[PDB]
Amino acid sequence: EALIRDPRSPINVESLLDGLNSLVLDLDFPALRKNKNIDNFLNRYEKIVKKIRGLQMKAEDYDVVKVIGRGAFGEVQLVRHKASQKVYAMKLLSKFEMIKRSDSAFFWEERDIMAFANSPWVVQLFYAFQDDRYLYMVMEYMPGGDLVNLMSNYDVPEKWAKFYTAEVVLALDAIHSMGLIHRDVKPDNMLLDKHGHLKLADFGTCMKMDETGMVHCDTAVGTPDYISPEVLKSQGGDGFYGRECDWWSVGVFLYEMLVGDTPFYADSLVGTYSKIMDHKNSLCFPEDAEISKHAKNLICAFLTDREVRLGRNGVEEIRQHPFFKNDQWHWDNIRETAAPVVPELSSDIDSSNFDDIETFPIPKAFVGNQLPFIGFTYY
Numbered sequence: 001e002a003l004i005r006d007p008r009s010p011i012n013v014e015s016l017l018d019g020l021n022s023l024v025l026d027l028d029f030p031a032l033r034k035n036k037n038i039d040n041f042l043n044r045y046e047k048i049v050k051k052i053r054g055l056q057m058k059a060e061d062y063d064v065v066k067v068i069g070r071g072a073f074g075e076v077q078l079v080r081h082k083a084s085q086k087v088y089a090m091k092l093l094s095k096f097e098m099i100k101r102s103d104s105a106f107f108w109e110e111r112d113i114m115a116f117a118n119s120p121w122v123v124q125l126f127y128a129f130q131d132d133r134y135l136y137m138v139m140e141y142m143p144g145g146d147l148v149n150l151m152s153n154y155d156v157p158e159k160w161a162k163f164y165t166a167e168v169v170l171a172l173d174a175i176h177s178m179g180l181i182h183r184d185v186k187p188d189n190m191l192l193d194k195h196g197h198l199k200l201a202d203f204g205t206c207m208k209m210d211e212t213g214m215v216h217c218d219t220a221v222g223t224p225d226y227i228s229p230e231v232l233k234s235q236g237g238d239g240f241y242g243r244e245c246d247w248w249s250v251g252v253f254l255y256e257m258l259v260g261d262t263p264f265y266a267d268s269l270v271g272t273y274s275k276i277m278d279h280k281n282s283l284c285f286p287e288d289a290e291i292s293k294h295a296k297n298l299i300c301a302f303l304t305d306r307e308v309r310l311g312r313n314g315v316e317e318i319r320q321h322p323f324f325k326n327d328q329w330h331w332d333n334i335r336e337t338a339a340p341v342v343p344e345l346s347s348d349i350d351s352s353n354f355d356d357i358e359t360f361p362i363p364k365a366f367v368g369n370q371l372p373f374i375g376f377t378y379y
């Protein structure tokens, strides 16, 4: 009875309602309705279930203002909740696409992190809900935009890069202390709030660690420009690695902010993969770079193999690095100091810091396509 009230429980009221609602969806087809048992359930429950569908949070309760992000299986929408008039970013994930592409389980960690991290470094989730087509995650809007947009609009000086690198480190350290490795650290995932401070956002590739702090994985995951050698090398077989893969992707981020291009750019994915493999040779700063010895040192200390990578022993050895010497902020208070770019926002749906941007087949027998999504609804 404690778990029925526990928002972390798999058998709370919201998951029970998901169970009943998924069942009705997956049975209500005339073919399956020839079974009398199936029809005896559906006629008894159809009316109340459609009443429940209207009363629970649904997509029509939101006004879609503009699309501000896209991803493999859906989009992010800037929405206004009609009743409350509050403003949110709503992420949609396609159930058809996720089933078709056998990718229907990455979203639990994403949901739980944003729902429960309760951290200034993690975008908070207020509501998760679903309909027969989509999963929805209603998050706090990040009007600052992402670091892609920022780098597109400024020549980033080393004083700014110091700041964003420090905040990314504290954000990644925060996610580490929850037992997770991010595995897909990129400027597209680094968003800025009303005040210009960083939060992490796309936790689709995240994974919980061992008691050893390790993870077993055989799939290379993340983004090609930012993937570390150990994760890339794990596509073969029996990859065993720890959180220090996120520090590799901080180094790629530092290079990109200061140099203007990713360190292992290539005109093919296949080329990028090969450069990362050959990183001890392909990593090469342009001659006209004009980047400090301290910045080059930190970048190079991140863009190494895990055995000699800065951060392997913890974050303290990152924090004391001389590149982070500065007269603006400390590691203790950085988020309470002034950001390099404070966003000038004209409305609560000002979206000026974001660039502009098939159904299930009717079953013949019970397939259960709605079953992988039971328990996703939250609050």
Ligand SMILES: CNC(=O)c1cccc(Cn2ccc3cc(-c4conc4C)ccc3c2=O)c1
Pocket (backbone or CB within 6 Å): 068, 069, 070, 071, 072, 073, 074, 075, 076, 089, 091, 092, 093, 106, 123, 139, 140, 141, 142, 143, 191, 201, 202, 203, 204
């Ligand atoms: C398997 N993963 C996918 O298919 C997938 C589907 C949709 C989007 C993404 C990646 N992406 C992109 C932009 C984005 C913006 C915000 C945001 C927070 O606050 N304000 C804003 C704006 C929050 C999350 C995301 C985000 O996740 C991935």
